[PDB]
Structure formats: C-alpha cells, structure tokens
Amino acid sequence: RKYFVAANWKCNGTLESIKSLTNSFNNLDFDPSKLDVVVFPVSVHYDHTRKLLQSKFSTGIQNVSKFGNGSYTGEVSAEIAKDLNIEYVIIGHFERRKYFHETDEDVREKLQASLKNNLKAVVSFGESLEQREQNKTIEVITKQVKAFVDLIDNFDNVILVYEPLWAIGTGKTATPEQAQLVHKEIRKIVKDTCGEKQANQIRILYGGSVNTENCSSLIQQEDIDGFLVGNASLKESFVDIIKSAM
C-alpha cells in the first residue's frame, strides 16, 4: 500500500491564484513512485492546472457523468476525460449528494463508467451526525460501500474515502480512533466481498477537516492510508500534509 494524498480545491481558484499555489506545491521534493498525490481543480481550470503542476503530481476532475457521450448538457463523460488523459475522478462527494441529489445508484453508475474508460476513482461516503447519533454509522457506511464495491476489479485504481459528513468543512475532525474504527470495518467489507489480498491492497483515506496539525496522528492509524483534503489544500502549507505521508 502506497499512501495517497489528494487536494480537492472544490469551487475555488483564479488563474493567478493557481499559478501561485502550484508553484509552492512544485517546490516540495517527493517521490511519486512512493506516494500518490493528486490535485482536483475545477473542470475549466484543469488544463491550466495540469500545465503548471510538475508530473510528480497526478490530476483529476471533481465529478464525472453517469452517462456516456450524448445529449447531457453540462456533463463531462468518462470517455471525454479519457481522451484528455485525465487520470482520476472524485465520485460520491458529500457536496454532490447534498446539493445535487446524487444517489448511491449515481455513484455506482459513475464508477462503472469511470472504470470502463480507464479512469481511477476516489469514491467518498460517510454518515451524517444524525445517523451517528442514532448509532447507525457502520450500517450506513456498509450500505454506501456495498452500493459499488462489486465493480472494483483492479484494487490500485479505486481509492475509498471515509468522510463523516459532520467533519467536512466544519473543523470537527474525526479523532484517529474514531476514523480507524470505521476504516477497519470498510477494509473488512472489502475482504468479505473481494478477498483478503484485494482488501490489503486497496487504499482507504480519511477526509473531514484534515489540516497540518492533525494529519500525522490520522495517517499513523493502521487502516488509514492518506487523505482527501478540502479547505487545507487551498493553502501553500498543504505541502506539510503531503509530508506527513512521506
């Protein structure tokens, strides 16, 4: 298991601010055969971003269509991404499930499209504060992971991300012990449905207010293999979060 650190810029950036930020990220000396680091700019920033980042950084887009090419105004198909040599996609992010009504079935259809078209997928899921307070966290996560887990065929090319919804953008980070408990269950699902070797190969990242202060204690946990990072990835100090995985 290679550790994996991903910057989700969400809906942020200007041409100038991406030049300044990618310059800082390029100054970090790391070996991309030892750690995957991926940046996810806004779609219209993808070209600018890929041009500026050195190739040690992988790139991807923040969403991909559940449909293939055709009459889907506004959508970007996995086929189109493949032809732009876009390497990664994020699927299942809380913001898409929340504001745009994306369902588990949408997530399954997007992963199917992504794998069919040679895209690697960062697939996110997690329980709300209400579900956690009803003591339903593992049941929720188990249902969300089983919505798509049978589609995975190469266990290096799908990366799972546990982001409890209450930790996203709030500063209320899960503790390393809370994250680990859930990651151990996610890995156990993959073991059950896919086999032990596959479960030991797959990366399971944590996300939900990861920052420079708390990242080392999270990644030290046995079943936490890196991070999907939102607000902290817009800052030049994001390099220190990469360093925690080095």
UniProtKB/Swiss-Prot annotation:
- SUPFAM superfamilies assigned to the protein according to its UniProt record, in alphabetical order: Triosephosphate isomerase (TIM)
EC category name: isomerase
Pfam families for the chain: TIM
A biological-process GO annotation: glycolytic process
- Catalyzed reactions: D-glyceraldehyde 3-phosphate = dihydroxyacetone phosphate
Which residues are recorded as binding D-glyceraldehyde 3-phosphate?
8, 10, 169, 228, 230-231
Pathway in which this enzyme or protein is active: Carbohydrate biosynthesis; gluconeogenesis; Carbohydrate degradation; glycolysis; D-glyceraldehyde 3-phosphate from glycerone phosphate: step 1/1
| Consequence recorded when altering residue 94 to A | 2-fold decrease in substrate affinity
- Give the PROSITE patterns listed for this entry: TIM_1, TIM_2
Entry keywords, A to Z? Gluconeogenesis, Glycolysis, Isomerase
Task: List the record's Gene Ontology CC terms alphabetically.
Answer: cytosol
Q: Molecular function terms in GO for this entry?
A: identical protein binding; triose-phosphate isomerase activity
Q: EC number(s) for this protein?
A: 5.3.1.1
What residues make up the catalytic site? 93, 163
Q: What does this protein do?
A: Catalyzes the interconversion of glyceraldehyde 3-phosphate and dihydroxyacetone phosphate in the glycolytic and gluconeogenic pathways.
Q: How does it assemble?
A: Homodimer.
Belongs to which family? Belongs to the triosephosphate isomerase family.
Recorded hits in HAMAP family, A to Z, give: TIM_B
Name of the protein described by the UniProt record? Triosephosphate isomerase
- Species whose genome carries this gene: Plasmodium falciparum
